[PDB]
RNA sequence: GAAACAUCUCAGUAUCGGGAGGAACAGAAAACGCAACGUGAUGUCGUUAGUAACCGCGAGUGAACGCGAUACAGCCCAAAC
RNA sequence: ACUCGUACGGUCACUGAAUCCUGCCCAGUGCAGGUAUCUGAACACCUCGUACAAGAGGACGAAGGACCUGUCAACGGCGGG
RNA sequence: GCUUUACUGCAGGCUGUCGCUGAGGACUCUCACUCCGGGAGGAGGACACCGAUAGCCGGGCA
């Protein structure tokens, strides 16, 4: 039969309908008064967290991060620029807000490594994402068969190098075939045309 | 210059002379779905747009004749080389 | 071109700032819980560097010593009151509701509790005109009829130092000394006396503005100079 | 007054001094920042790619 | 550079911010589409090819599938119970 | 920033002590106000089209413009016969 | 370098529209949101701000 988890999942398929709508309108009021990065005891979306690798265990942390909505906050050119490069308003950044959120979180927790992250809504001027972080130094995780892979030296600062799922997604690596010519094995190796 | 609305002349379709009706070619309306329309949408962004930033030129002092010759029997039309004419009026 | 003087202003550099560190007090209405019960004695009269006008040093019953925006006629020894049930005498502060109509007022609040905003310069005063359960209408020194919350506190009387504007500076040195006490760059070079690169009105072989002086409200900074969105100019007609 | 020789005689101010971190006489004693290694500005050592030809 | 120049080009280059390793990244198909009764994770090398595709259709720009090689390796969760 | 500031303020400009004065012009340009009617983009809406879509048209119509007025110690003008 | 009713653009201002955004062609309300208030609480309020887009002005700048 259905898992209790499937109900949290189904509720989040429409964050603007039913009980969840009322809930969001209430929580966001408290979220707007909270900081940039807020550690939280439990994930707002259990199904999603667990689905992404989360575990109610020592060394597993979660934090809600809010980033501003919109395009790039760009400074206009202060020297000669051809009309193509004179833009300011319509320029958007190449990393998505979820990715910015992940990085701001990882910086708050220098010792932890980003496992994954998910959206928890947005108001008219900002978006919130909850990031799941992992303590690669706690033996509770160094012995966890499912998560000890993140303890490897090469997983250090995995978020800053785009090894996160949202990172890889944003790097245009989803497709294994057509369209991923300039993306795999890396954007930089492909001359930065991805 | 004056020009007969109808007259006998060669019909390239029937391969024999027939009474044709002369008509001034009315401009057909655009769909906005041709390749050039798509390229305009695609290639237009921040700053100058290259060719898509140009504005159509002027006019020649006199335009050439732009007519359609419609065959009276088979009902088909054919085009001809036009000639410079300030004004072209039809007779009947 | 180069940024005009109006643009350098906004950067808040030393040259454009006011000598705050030399300023005495942020003369605001003393806060009272309720009931009105609060009075104080004028201990001294001081010169206010920020406003070129006198200010009264007042010591309250609870022991608080604060400088106050003094109206005309206040002297050492006088007892000032502040509260809903204060005496309707010059120098006292109470909400516009408790202030009888037709009486001159100064240092009026814009929003109840803000500490005073309107009518604070030398000699000016606001005229309290109409009462109501919802709004008290006041005529500000500019002549504008201002509808305000009757709970907005205000002091009775005209601000001290009236007539300061009547005597001419006479010489540049006097202006110099006053200017040095304000957040202002002085003297003033006329735009028309500058190079094209420095101001929209600069350039030419003779001094005259380039285009007409009346500039649209929508003009961007760097161009908004001269007569800003003027509804008219001149004196005739 | 000439900006040359006559204006040189007033130069008796001390700015750049031996840096505690790098040893170079570039520690600006007024700014408390080393113009050579960035001591006082950053934990990381001041270094730029333009300090050498692009192909090196 | 386009014998000017704005799209284009120089070039995602120079330079800048952040970060890992001894190598990085990628990687076990919601692939391919020599359309098949076919191939079978990923890098890379040779080729496919200056081909397809782009472009004031100007100057210029520019892949991939496949193939021959190198090396080969395949697995773990979430949930159901 | 102005600003420990609030129109007897401070911003933006012109002229340049005193004295005697400072005419006429609002057509153009600028600024500002108004506006029956006209014009005026996108979203949403309606018609056609497409088993959808591209697209074509319609209806409504903001600021702005037309039009009207104010204004020269605004830019400026003050002739020929 | 500078100018402008040169060409082409880019900021910026004004304006409509979508989102934030809710209850009962004009209107009432309060609960988001904003501001004032030490606070209690007051004013404002689905507007404003902010994010997005559209039209206009736009040598301020390239
Ligand atoms: Cl990390
Ligand atoms: Cl014709
Ligand atoms: Cl003054
Ligand atoms: Cl194959
Ligand atoms: K160029
Ligand atoms: Mg590589
Ligand atoms: Mg004060
Ligand atoms: Mg004066
Ligand atoms: Mg000063
Ligand atoms: Mg002057
Ligand atoms: Mg000069
Ligand atoms: Mg000169
Ligand atoms: Mg200029
Ligand atoms: Mg002069
Ligand atoms: Mg002059
Ligand atoms: Mg060239
Ligand atoms: Mg050419
Ligand atoms: Mg290229
Ligand atoms: Mg392919
Ligand atoms: Mg002079
Ligand atoms: Mg505040
Ligand atoms: Mg220029
Ligand atoms: Na970290
Ligand atoms: Na690309
Ligand atoms: Na394209
Ligand atoms: Na050339
Ligand atoms: Na040239
Ligand atoms: Na091109
Ligand atoms: Na006129
Ligand atoms: Na020059
Ligand atoms: Sr690190
Ligand atoms: Sr494009
Ligand atoms: Sr364009
Ligand atoms: Sr011609
Ligand atoms: Sr104040
Ligand atoms: Sr205050
Ligand atoms: Sr001039
Ligand atoms: Sr006059
Ligand atoms: Sr000198
Ligand atoms: Sr000296
Ligand atoms: Sr520092
Ligand atoms: Sr460096
Ligand atoms: Sr294999
Ligand atoms: Sr005079
Ligand atoms: Sr006029």
Query: Domains plus CATH for chain A?
Result: 1-194 (3.40.1120.10)
Q: Are strands B89-91 and B2-4 parallel, antiparallel or unpaired?
A: parallel
Judge whether D14 is annotated as a binding position: no
Q: Which nucleotides of G are covered by protein (CB under 7 A)?
A: 1-5, 8-14, 19-21, 32-40, 42-43, 49-53, 57-62
Nearest to C35 by CA among C80, C85, C94: C85
Range of the domain at D51: 1-56
Give B49 to chain A, closest Cα distance, Å: 9
Residue in chain B nearest A82 by alpha carbon: B47
**Cis check: omega of the bond before C77, within 30 degrees of 0:** no
**Cis check: omega of the bond before C187, within 30 degrees of 0:** yes
| Structural tokens at position C207 | 């001094």
Distance between CA atoms of residues A100 and C117, nearest Å = 44
CB atoms within 10 A of CB C6: 13
Q: Indicate the DSSP class of residue C101.
A: T
Nearest to C55 by CA among C118, C122, C119: C122
Distance between CA atoms of residues B34 and B51, nearest Å = 16
Distance between CA atoms of residues B75 and B18, nearest Å = 10
Run of H or E including B36: helix B35-42
The alpha-helical segments, DSSP class H, found in chain D are: 5-8
B53 contacts chain A (CB < 8 A): no
DSSP labels for A85-121?
GG--TT---SS-HHHHHHHHHHHHSTT-EEEEEEEEE
User: What is the distance in angstroms measured between the alpha-carbon CA of A175 and the sugar C1' of E37?
Assistant: 29
Contact A193, A181 (CB under 8 A): no
Distance between CA atoms of residues B48 and B68, nearest Å = 40
* Secondary structure class of C126 (helix, strand, coil): strand
From the candidates B47, B48, B50, B52, which should be mutated to test the interface with A, based on the most A CB atoms within 10 A?
B47
Judge whether D37 is annotated as a binding position: yes
From the candidates A84, A85, A88, A89, which should be mutated to test the interface with B, based on the most B CB atoms within 10 A?
A84
CATH of the domain at D42: 2.20.25.30
Q: How far is CA C222 from CA A49, A86, A88, in A?
A: 53, 19, 19
Nearest to C163 by CA among C25, C29, C52, C40: C52
Backbone angle region of C2, left / alpha / beta, with phi > 0 → left and psi within -120 to 50 → alpha: beta
Residue the block writes with tokens 């002092």:
B61
DSSP labels for chain A?
---SHHHHHHHTT-TTSHHHHHHHHHHHHHHTTS-SEEE-SS-S-HHHHHHTT--SSTTEEEEEEEEE-SS---PPPSS---GGGG--TT---SS-HHHHHHHHHHHHSTT-EEEEEEEEEE-SSEEEEEEEEE-TT-HHHHT-TTTGGGGSGGGTTTTTTT-SHHHHHHTT-S-SSTT-TTTSS-TTTTTT--
Q: Is the CB of C232 under 7 A from strand F?
A: yes
Nearest to C42 by CA among C23, C66, C8, C20: C66
Residue the block writes with tokens 């509790």:
C113
Indicate yes or no: CB of B46 within 8 angstroms of CB of A86: yes
The CATH-assigned architecture of domain C1-78 is Beta Barrel (2.40)
Q: Is the CB of D44 under 7 A from strand E?
A: yes
CB atoms within 10 A of CB C91: 24
The CATH-assigned architecture of domain C160-237 is Irregular (4.10)
| Structural tokens at position C31 | 């806060």
Distance between CA atoms of residues B32 and B16, nearest Å = 39
Q: Which nucleotides of E are covered by protein (CB under 7 A)?
A: 6-9, 12-16, 18-22, 24-33, 41-44, 54-58, 63-65, 76-81
Residues of B in contact with A91 (CB under 8 A): 46
CATH of the domain at B12: 3.10.450.80
Distance between CA atoms of residues A184 and A168, nearest Å = 10
From the candidates B46, B50, B52, which should be mutated to test the interface with A, based on the most A CB atoms within 10 A?
B46
Residue the block writes with tokens 């070079």:
C189
Q: Please state the domain count of chain D.
A: 1
| Residue of least CA–C1' distance to F31 | C214
Nearest nucleotide by C1' position to the C25 CA atom: F4
Question: What topology is assigned to C82-159 in CATH?
Answer: SH3 type barrels. (2.30.30)
Please state the domain extents for chain C: 1-78, 82-159, 160-237
| Structural tokens at position C210 | 């380039």
Residue in chain B nearest A83 by alpha carbon: B47
Contact A127, A67 (CB under 8 A): yes
Chains interfacing with A (3 or more CB pairs < 8 Å): B
Contact A47, A8 (CB under 8 A): yes
User: What is the distance in angstroms measured between the alpha-carbon CA of A119 and the sugar C1' of G33?
Assistant: 23
Indicate yes or no: CB of B45 within 8 angstroms of CB of A85: no
* Secondary structure class of B37 (helix, strand, coil): helix
* Secondary structure class of C50 (helix, strand, coil): coil
Contact B11, B71 (CB under 8 A): yes
Distance between CA atoms of residues A141 and A150, nearest Å = 9
Contact A62, A49 (CB under 8 A): yes
Distance between CA atoms of residues A155 and A135, nearest Å = 12
Q: Indicate the DSSP class of residue B64.
A: B
B48 contacts chain A (CB < 8 A): yes
Range of the domain at B10: 1-92
CA B50-A73-B44 angle, to 5 degrees, is 15
Cα of C184 from ligand 15 centre, angstroms: 25
Distance between CA atoms of residues C137 and C149, nearest Å = 9
Strands (E), chain C: 39-48, 53-60, 65-68, 79-81, 93-95, 104-106, 126-130, 136-139, 145-148, 153-156, 214-215, 227-228
């Amino acid at each position: 039969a259905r898992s209790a988890y499937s109900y949290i999942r189904d509720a989040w398929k429409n964050p603007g309908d039913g009980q969840l709508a009322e809930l969001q309108w209430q929580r966001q009021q408290e979220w707007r008064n909270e900081g940039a990065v807020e550690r939280i005891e439990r994930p707002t979306r259990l199904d999603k967290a667990r689905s992404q690798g989360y575990k109610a265990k020592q060394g597993v942390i979660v934090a809600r991060v809010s980033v501003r909505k919109g395009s790039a906050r760009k400074r206009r050119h202060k020297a000669g620029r051809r009309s193509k490069r004179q833009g300011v308003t319509r320029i958007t950044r190449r990393k998505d807000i979820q990715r910015v959120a992940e990085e701001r979180a990882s910086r708050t927790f220098p010792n932890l490594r980003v496992l994954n992250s998910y959206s928890v809504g947005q108001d008219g001027r900002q978006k919130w994402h909850e990031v799941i972080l992992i303590d690669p130094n706690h033996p509770a995780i160094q012995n966890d068969d499912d998560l000890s892979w993140i303890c490897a030296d090469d997983q250090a600062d995995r978020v800053f190098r785009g090894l996160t799922g949202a990172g890889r997604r944003n790097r245009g690596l989803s497709g294994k075939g057509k369209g991923s010519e300039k993306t795999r094995p890396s954007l930089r190796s492909n001359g930065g045309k991805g | 210059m004056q020009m007969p609305r109808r007259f006998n002349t060669y019909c390239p379709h029937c391969n024999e002379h027939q009474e044709h009706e002369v008509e001034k070619v009315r401009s057909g309306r655009q769909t906005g779905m041709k390749w050039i329309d798509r390229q305009r949408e695609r290639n237009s962004g921040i700053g100058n747009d290259g060719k898509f930033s140009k504005v159509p030129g002027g006019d020649k002092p006199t335009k050439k004749t732009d007519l359609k010759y419609r065959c009276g029997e088979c009902g088909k039309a054919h085009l001809r080389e036009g000639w410079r004419a300030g004004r072209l009026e039809f007779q009947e | 071109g180069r940024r005009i003087q109006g643009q350098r202003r906004g950067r808040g550099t030393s040259t454009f700032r006011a000598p705050s560190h030399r300023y005495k007090a942020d003369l605001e209405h003393r806060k009272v819980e309720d009931g009105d019960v609060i009075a104080g004695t004028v201990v001294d009269i001081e010169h206010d560097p920020a406003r070129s006008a006198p200010v009264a040093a007042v010591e309250f019953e609870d022991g608080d010593r604060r400088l106050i925006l003094a109206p005309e006629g206040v002297g050492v020894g006088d007892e000032l009151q502040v509260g809903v049930s204060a005496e309707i005498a010059p120098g006292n502060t109470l909400p516009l509701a408790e202030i009888p109509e037709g009486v001159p007022v100064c240092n009026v609040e814009s929003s109840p509790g803000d500490g005073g905003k309107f009518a604070r310069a030398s000699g000016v005063n606001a005229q309290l005109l109409t009462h109501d359960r919802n709004v008290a209408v006041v005529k500000l020194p500019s002549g504008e009829m201002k509808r305000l919350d009757p709970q907005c506190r205000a002091t009775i009387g005209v601000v001290a130092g009236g007539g300061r504007t009547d005597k001419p500076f006479v010489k540049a040195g006097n202006k110099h000394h006053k200017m040095k006490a304000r957040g202002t760059k002085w003297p003033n070079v006329r735009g028309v006396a500058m190079n094209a690169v420095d101001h929209p009105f600069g350039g030419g072989g003779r001094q005259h503005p380039g285009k007409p002086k009346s500039i649209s409200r929508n003009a961007p900074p760097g161009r908004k100079v001269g007569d800003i969105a003027s509804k008219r100019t001149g004196r005739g007609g | 007054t000439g900006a040359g020789t006559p204006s040189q005689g007033k130069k008796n101010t001390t700015t750049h001094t031996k840096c505690r971190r790098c040893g170079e006489k570039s520690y600006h004693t007024k700014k408390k920042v080393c113009s050579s290694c960035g001591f006082g500005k950053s934990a990381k050592r001041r270094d730029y790619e333009w300090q050498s030809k692009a192909g090196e």
